[PDB]
Amino acid sequence: AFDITVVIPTFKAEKTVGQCLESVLSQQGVSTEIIVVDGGSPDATISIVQSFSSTNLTIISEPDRGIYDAINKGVSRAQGGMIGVLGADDVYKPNVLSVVKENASRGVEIVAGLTLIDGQLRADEQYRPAALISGIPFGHNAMFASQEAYRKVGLYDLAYRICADAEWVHRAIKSDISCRKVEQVFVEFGNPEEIIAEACSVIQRNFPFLLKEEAKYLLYGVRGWGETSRIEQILRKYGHESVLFVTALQEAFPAVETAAALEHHHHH
């Protein structure tokens, strides 16, 4: 019934929710449903959300198990053709929703754009198997996914409080969900061991034969935070387990092509 659904999880968002909503309601060229999933804010959040045009805006306000629980409730109710998720500290840039509608017109399942963070572009990676030894390849708040993409992939895994976004996109890649990356900014905004722990866990969900430290090595290698002289060793160790894994490494690290060809030849 709507081109776009925007799911906005909120808790105590009074300082910025107005700006968030203004970036959504101002979007021209589309019909947009907004679902605000509030976790029981005691501040001005609900009143401010109510200060906007309510025609296509639903407010859920009730306790939840966190951001991704709230997102799941919103996604589950969404009626739009493409579904985006915006945090209250985020803004969509002008004309972004019309750009999503235009770029979704041939039936791609995910349309993702660029993200501006503290005035710099997020260092995005390609949506491909190489992302499976990394994190989320684009900003989650720059992502729009269709009803069918959510039906096929499913919901966000609440076990991940930091990286459920990455884990969902990794599932999309593994499920061969189609994706179109648009080279335009869609969204603007401004404990490391826990983040690293979750990111390594997400990678092991793709490749369960990896030790945590090997998942970490691969993540740091693809992101450029660490060295790569052990990639070939990792490839020899596990290549036989999974053609997807061999593919992921040869994409991430094209210099290991001669060794990856050898894994393919012997095992796949």
Ligand SMILES: C[C@@H]1O[C@H](OP(=O)(O)OP(=O)(O)OC[C@H]2O[C@@H](n3cnc4c(=O)[nH]c(N)nc43)[C@H](O)[C@@H]2O)[C@@H](O)[C@H](O)[C@@H]1O
């Ligand atoms: C929206 C998500 O934000 C993540 O940023 P991440 O710093 O964790 O989370 P924050 O930026 O602090 O909060 C994100 C949004 O969720 C709301 N919020 C925070 N906690 C809760 C909660 O317990 N329940 C509900 N209903 N709302 C909550 C907050 O008001 C804000 O709009 C991204 O990493 C994800 O990719 C996605 O963009």
